[PDB]
């Protein structure tokens, strides 16, 4: 486990997407996680379908919200997930139309990080790859972030309200951080990314609800 790692540099990350006016962030987090592993396992990098999840995961609420663990279990039971091309994103709830022939991957379960354990989280990102996480993205300081390691005393570790993708970690000007991939488009934050404080008392609940798919 290095002191710094960026999976974008390793080609384990697809370009930044934009969920739009739909609470499908959980879907984008799941997908991002699957894409890392799929890349790690097969050597290819393609866009998996968040819409597949939105319409098909019955234990979740589509645009009204959901959990990544539910999304992972779905892919396992369904024995697959479609590629973005085979099931494009519409940003709206629709009936499940999973196309078996557009299948791009699947998974055989998932693994959760010990709640609140930033150490294990780092270990997971180092060992396995991009990890799905939930944070508190309610603060105005988060909405308008652009540079530097983000942090705010007002952040609530118990009000988890946004699922996001941990694609790395490092240290900038003395500050350890998490390299986070958002789904609000590229013109947001730093080209769609945000570096959030690491080892700063589990800032914004970064390690409270994290997991990764297993293939
Ligand atoms: C996430 O999507 N978080 N919400 C957003 O990011 C919002 C959604 C609103 C529709 C506005 N912003 C947005 O969509 O805008 C994009 C944008 C913003 C600014 C500039 C440009 C573009 N949805 N939240 C969840 O899914 C949560 C998180 C989960 C990981 C804990 N889950 C949830 O609400 O629970 C649902 C549930 C599931 C199963 C059983 C019971 C409940």
């Amino acid at each position: 486990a290095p002191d710094s790692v960026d999976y974008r540099k390793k080609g384990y990350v697809t370009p930044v997407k934009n969920q739009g006016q739909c609470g499908s962030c959980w879907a984008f987090s799941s997908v991002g996680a699957l894409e890392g592993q799929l890349k790690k396992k097969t050597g290819k990098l393609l866009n998996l379908s968040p819409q597949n999840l939105v319409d098909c995961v019955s234990e979740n609420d589509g645009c009204g919200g959901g959990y990544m663990t539910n999304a992972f279990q779905y892919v396992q039971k369904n024995r697959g997930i479609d590629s973005e091309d085979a099931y494009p994103y519409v940003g709206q709830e629709e009936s499940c139309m999973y196309n078996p022939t557009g299948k791009a991957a699947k998974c055989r379960g998932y693994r959760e990080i010990p709640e609140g354990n930033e150490k294990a989280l780092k270990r997971a990102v180092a060992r396995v790859g991009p990890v799905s996480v939930a944070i508190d993205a309610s603060l105005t300081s988060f909405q308008f972030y652009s540079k530097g390691v983000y942090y705010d005393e007002s952040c609530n570790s118990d009000n988890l309200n946004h699922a996001v993708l941990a694609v790395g970690y490092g240290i900038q000007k003395g500050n350890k951080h998490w390299i986070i991939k958002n789904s609000w488009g590229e013109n947001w934050g730093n080209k769609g990314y945000i570096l959030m404080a690491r080892n700063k008392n589990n800032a914004c609940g970064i390690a409270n609800l994290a997991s990764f798919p297993k293939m």
Side-chain angles (χ1 to χ4, degrees), residues 88-158:
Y89 187 66
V90 302
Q92 192 188 227
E93 310 168 321
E94 308 194 324
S95 56
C96 184
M97 203 78 258
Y98 168 66
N99 178 336
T101 66
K103 182 184 51 181
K106 71 168 164 76
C107 76
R108 310 199 287 147
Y110 64 78
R111 186 288 192 169
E112 300 182 282
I113 283 60
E115 170 197 287
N117 207 336
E118 283 195 87
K119 271 160 278 299
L121 183 58
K122 170 190 172 172
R123 178 213 326 204
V125 179
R127 187 77 61 264
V128 176
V131 177
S132 301
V133 287
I135 59 177
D136 170 25
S138 62
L139 280 300
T140 294
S141 65
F142 189 95
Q143 175 166 166
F144 298 98
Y145 167 94
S146 40
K147 281 166 189 293
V149 173
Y150 176 85
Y151 171 90
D152 190 326
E153 291 172 89
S154 305
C155 226
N156 196 327
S157 67
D158 271 303

Side-chain angles (χ1 to χ4, degrees), residues 18-26 59-61 64-68 70 134 160-163 183-184 188 209:
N18 187 12
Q19 61 180 88
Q21 286 292 349
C22 170
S24 53
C25 55
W26 59 272
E59 295 78 32
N60 279 171
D61 306 310
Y67 292 74
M68 300 83 80
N70 275 159
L160 305 185
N161 46 68
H162 194 39
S183 51
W184 294 349
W188 171 89
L209 196 72

Side-chain angles (χ1 to χ4, degrees), residues 156-188:
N156 196 327
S157 67
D158 271 303
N159 182 350
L160 305 185
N161 46 68
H162 194 39
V164 94
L165 192 71
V167 84
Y169 61 91
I171 175 176
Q172 175 171 270
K173 311 306 304 304
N175 310 298
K176 300 193 184 168
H177 66 255
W178 290 118
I179 307 180
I180 302 311
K181 193 191 176 187
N182 202 6
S183 51
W184 294 349
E186 295 213 55
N187 285 197
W188 171 89

